[PDB]
Amino acid sequence: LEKTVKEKLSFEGVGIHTGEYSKLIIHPEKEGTGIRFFKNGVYIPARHEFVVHTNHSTDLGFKGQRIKTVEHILSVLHLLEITNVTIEVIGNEIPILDGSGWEFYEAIRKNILNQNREIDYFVVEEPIIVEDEGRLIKAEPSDTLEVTYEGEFKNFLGRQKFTFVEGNEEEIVLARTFCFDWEIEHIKKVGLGKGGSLKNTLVLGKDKVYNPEGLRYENEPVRHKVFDLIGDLYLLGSPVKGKFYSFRGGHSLNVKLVKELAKKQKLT
Ligand SMILES: CCCCCCCCCCCCCC(=O)O[C@@H]1[C@@H](CC(=O)NO)CO[C@H](CO)[C@H]1O
Numbered sequence: 698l699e700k701t702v703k704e705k706l707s708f709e710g711v712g713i714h715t716g717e718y719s720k721l722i723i724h725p726e727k728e729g730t731g732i733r734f735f736k737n738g739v740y741i742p743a744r745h746e747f748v749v750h751t752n753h754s755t756d757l758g759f760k761g762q763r764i765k766t767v768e769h770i771l772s773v774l775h776l777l778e779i780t781n782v783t784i785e786v787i788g789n790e791i792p793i794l795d796g797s798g799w800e801f802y803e804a805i806r807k808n809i810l811n812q813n814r815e816i817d818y819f820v821v822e823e824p825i826i827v828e829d830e831g832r833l834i835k836a837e838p839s840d841t842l843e844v845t846y847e848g849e850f851k852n853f854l855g856r857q858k859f860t861f862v863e864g865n866e867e868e869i870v871l872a873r874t875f876c877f878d879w880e881i882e883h884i885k886k887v888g889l890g891k892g893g894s895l896k897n898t899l900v901l902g903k904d905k906v907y908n909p910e911g912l913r914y915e916n917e918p919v920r921h922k923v924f925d926l927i928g929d930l931y932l933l934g935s936p937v938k939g940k941f942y943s944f945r946g947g948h949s950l951n952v953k954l955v956k957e958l959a960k961k962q963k964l965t
């Protein structure tokens with residue numbers, strides 16, 4: 698049934714690309730309200746259609762207002778099945794914190810409440826293949842939500858794939874975002890990642906790990922990618938059901954899958 702937060706929640710922390718202090722406040726809403734962001738007295742529904750800028754991060758914006766990196770929180774909400782919540786975002790981007798969703802998943806999981814209404818699950822009824830930038834993603838109808846990601850790294854990790862299935866969400870929430878020392882300069886050359894640090898960004902070396910804690914999962918970096926792929930699929934504003942596969946996929950290409958899925962099922 699519709700799920701909402703039992704009590705008001707709030708978080709605070711710098712933004713990975715903005716590197717500015719930002720705070721978020723979450724309040725309960727009415728059943729069938731959906732996920733919406735509020736700022737400067739402006740409400741901004743969280744749906745793909747609201748996608749204003751796609752890049753290493755997912756950004757939404759309406760009426761001249763914009764928010765960066767909103768896929769992470771959306772990913773946790775997706776796994777927890779949250780249908781009504783007003784996330785007030787004070788700032789220009791969602792705080793990166795440690796780089797994973799474990800923090801939001803940890804506090805919110807202890808403050809979830811049940812409402813009195815049945816949720817409308819989104820189910821894929823037809824497959825689809827999107828190829829672009831040398832990347833590719835395929836979707837297939839299914840009675841269970843499953844997402845597979847095949848990442849190809851040229852570092853010591855080499856190639857690694859991670860299959861997520863309903864009942865293994867605990868393995869895709871503690872995976873913090875990661876980056877390679879070779880692509881970092883590029884991300885920095887585009888004026889992004891000004892808040893990226895070793896405490897909120899896991900940096901890997903062609904053959905060495907920068908963070909002294911090492912990797913948290915033999916597939917931590919791909920676990921985060923899968924976690925992000927869901928955060929981008931929840932843009933539909935409702936739990937997605939079906940079997941999806943992604944090979945070296947990005948945010949824009951991912952949103953494209955959702956765009957065609959939401960525009961294809963437009964007839965129904
Ligand atoms: C050596 C010392 C380095 C100082 C600290 C480095 C800071 C770099 C600036 C941070 C930019 C983001 C890092 C990054 O590229 O992570 C990427 C991630 C981005 C993301 O999280 N989007 O939401 C999206 O998925 C890909 C692949 O999964 C990740 O590579």
Ligand SMILES: [Zn+2]
Pocket residue numbers: 874921925
């Ligand atoms: Zn990410």
